[PDB]
């Protein structure tokens, strides 16, 4: 709905309200290798998915899109794939959901898997194909596609292909930069697009964390200059930038140098996987992982918005960690996107694990191999649907019992569930609670200090 900007370390709208962008990753437009499994790699995606997201209270989607589908041959720009992106943006907007466009990849791309008749070196496991870059952009030097321990990023071929990209071999990085500019031009006047997550979990390539962070930042600087030129005649959207993929395994990393990100609309977006999928199950803790990320974002002078987080095991055991995560989002007043809305039976994550005949998903449960959606993973869903202020002027505090601030403008908040929220609204005029699908939307007007709390 209103255009988003950054001011004073927060995502805000142009009306001055502090915005919390909470929602999920949606991969229905991503281009995954099929890996010979003979199964869909994504679920269908249409307006009903965005209605379902709005019924959990979400007001953002991280839309995982693929360079391989935008630029299928060198220099191409597939406007028919752009029209599917634009349909998803419009279906999200019709349901009150902003879109982050995420140039997504795992393990470089679909073309890094070990071919069927090819063996692995001793001590390595077979690789499979994932998502990201097109085949023509994939320059592996012939290095083995097998990996250490089954970890998708720990393959010589993937590392070499990333290093070829950072070194701009054959101009492949200039191709992605131009593809980003062309895509930003397609949305330059669309306020529902938050902005651009320049590359998901950039791998180190053949560099250590410090030289990796530098080459990742050098790419971000090139992409930002191309995007800002392409936005001529529209307006500048937010630039969401990530540390290397190592943050997703350790809870911290070397940081892309600030001089590469010297644009006022950048947003730091590490993936906060502490106590979920880090190398250590204990360190950093969930809460220390937030403190590290918050300190890093403050170094950039930028907002923190975490593009991926999630738990993947039994909700009976892990819902308490999910609860702790949401609590910390409220303490730090950030948004982010759960991984993920749907995972299909032929997704590479399922293929890797030999789990293509087992149910998939940590939010929407898909039966396999049928592909049929069969309810929600309720222990996680109930945490993700928790009440929050979508937009609030001068927001100062967000807690489980409600929120408060000091400012002038329209408050908009979500509350889940069929029962009417029972609220104490201090200094809020014209309060209206509207039943909406899956919950309730609150509106009201502030003009100074205010609070909206449970009674």
Cβ neighbours of residue 352 under 8 Å, at least 6 residues apart?
A: 128, 150, 152
DSSP H or E stretch at residue 228: helix 209-230
- The residues near 244 (Cβ < 8 Å, ≥ 6 apart) are 201, 202, 203, 204, 209, 212, 213, 216, 253, 254
Q: Which helix (H) or strand (E) holds 414?
A: strand 402-416
Q: Which residues pair with 100 in a beta bridge?
A: 62, 195
How far apart CA 144 and CA 229 sit, in angstroms, is: 39
The backbone torsions φ and ψ at residue 329, rounded to the nearest 5 degrees and listed phi first, read -60, -40
- Rounded to 10 deg, the angle between the 286-300 and 315-332 helix axes is 30
Please, are residues 250 and 277 in contact by the beta-carbon 8 Å criterion? no
Q: Are 271 and 309 contacting, i.e. CB atoms less than 8 angstroms apart?
A: yes
Longest dimension (CA), the chain: 70
Is there a contact between 352 and 311 (Cβ–Cβ < 8 Å)? no
239: enclosing H helix or E strand? strand 238-241
CA distance 130 to 152: 9
Backbone angles phi, psi at 223, to 5 degrees: -65, -40
The Cβ of residue 445 has, within 10 Å, a number of other Cβ atoms equal to 15
Q: Are strands 98-103 and 60-65 parallel, antiparallel or unpaired?
A: parallel
Experimental method: X-ray
Q: Which residue bears the tokens 């644009």?
A: 263
Tell me, what DSSP letter sits at residue 286?
H
The answer to whether the CB of 31 falls within 8 A of the CB of 69 is: yes
Tokens of 284: 């950093």
Q: How many CA atoms lie within 13 A of 85 on its CB side?
A: 28
Map out the domains of the chain as residue ranges: 4-386, 387-455
Phi, psi angles (nearest 5°) of residue 86: -65, -35
Which listed CATH number (3.20.20.80, 3.40.50.2300, 2.60.40.3950, 3.30.310.50) goes with 4-386?
3.20.20.80
8 Å CB contact between 352 and 339 = no
302-305-306 Cα angle (round to 5): 135
Q: Indicate the SS3 state at residue 292.
A: helix
β-pairing, 266-268 with 238-241?
Answer: parallel
Task: Indicate the burial class of 266 (C-beta count within 10 angstroms; 0-12, 13-18, 19 or more).
Answer: buried
DSSP letter assigned to residue 11: E
Per DSSP, helices labelled H in 55-113 are 67-70, 79-94
Q: Cα angle vertex 451, ends 445, 453, to 5°?
A: 120
Q: Which residue has the tokens 């998502």?
A: 131
Angle between helices 172-185 and 209-230 (to 10 degrees): 40
The two beta strands, 402-416 and 395-399, are antiparallel
């Amino acid at each position: 709905l209103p255009r988003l900007t950054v001011e004073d370390g927060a995502i805000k709208d142009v009306d001055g309200r502090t915005v919390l962008l909470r929602g999920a990753n949606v991969n229905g437009l991503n281009d995954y290798a099929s890996n010979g499994a003979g199964l869909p790699t994504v679920a269908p995606l249409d307006r009903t998915d965005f209605e379902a997201m709005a019924a959990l209270g979400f007001d953002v989607v991280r839309l995982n899109i693929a360079w391989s589908a935008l630029e299928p041959t060198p220099g191409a720009f597939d406007a028919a794939y752009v029209a599917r992106i634009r349909e998803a943006v419009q279906d999200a907007k019709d349901n009150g959901i902003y879109t982050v466009l995420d140039m997504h990849q795992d393990a470089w791309g679909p073309y890094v898997g070990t071919p069927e008749g090819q063996d692995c070196p001793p001590l390595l496991q077979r690789g499979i194909g994932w998502d990201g870059a097109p085949e023509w952009a994939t320059l592996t030097g012939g290095w083995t596609t097998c990996n250490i321990g089954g970890q998708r990023e720990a393959s010589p071929a993937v590392a070499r292909a990333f290093q070829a990209f950072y070194d701009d071999e054959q101009g492949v990085q200039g191709h992605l930069v131009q593809t980003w500019a062309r895509l930003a031009a397609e949305f330059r006047n669309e306020p529902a697009v938050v902005g651009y997550d320049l590359l998901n979990e950039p791998n180190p390539g053949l560099r250590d964390p410090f030289a990796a962070a530098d080459q990742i930042g050098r790419f971000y600087q090139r992409a930002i200059a191309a995007i800002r030129q392409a936005e001529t005649g529209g307006f500048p959207h937010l630039v969401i930038f990530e540390p290397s993929a190592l943050w997703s395994a350790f809870g911290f990393d070397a940081l892309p140098p600030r001089h590469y990100l010297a644009d006022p609309l950048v947003v730091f977006s590490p993936h906060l996987y502490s106590q979920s999928i880090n190398v250590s199950s204990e360190f950093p803790s969930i809460e220390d992982g937030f403190r590290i990320a918050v300190a890093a974002a403050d170094w950039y002078g930028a907002p923190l918005w975490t593009g991926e987080w999630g738990w993947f095991g039994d909700p009976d055991e892990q819902a308490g960690q999910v609860r702790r995560f949401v609590d910390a989002m409220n303490t730090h007043r950030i948004g982010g996107a759960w991984w993920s809305w749907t995972q299909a039976c032929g997704d590479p994550h399922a293929v890797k694990d030999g789990n293509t005949a087992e149910p998939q998903g940590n939010l929407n449960r898909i039966d396999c191999p049928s592909g049929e959606e069969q309810g929600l993973v309720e222990g996680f869903a109930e945490q993700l649907a928790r009440a929050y202020p979508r937009a609030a002027p001068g927001l100062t505090e967000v807690a489980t019992e409600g929120f408060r601030g000091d400012g002038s403008g329209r408050i908009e908040a979500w509350y889940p569930g069929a029962e009417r929220p029972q609220l104490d609204t201090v200094n809020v005029a014209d309060v209206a609670l509207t039943r909406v699908d899956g919950g309730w939307r609150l509106i009201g007007e502030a003009a100074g200090e205010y609070s909206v709390t449970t009674l």
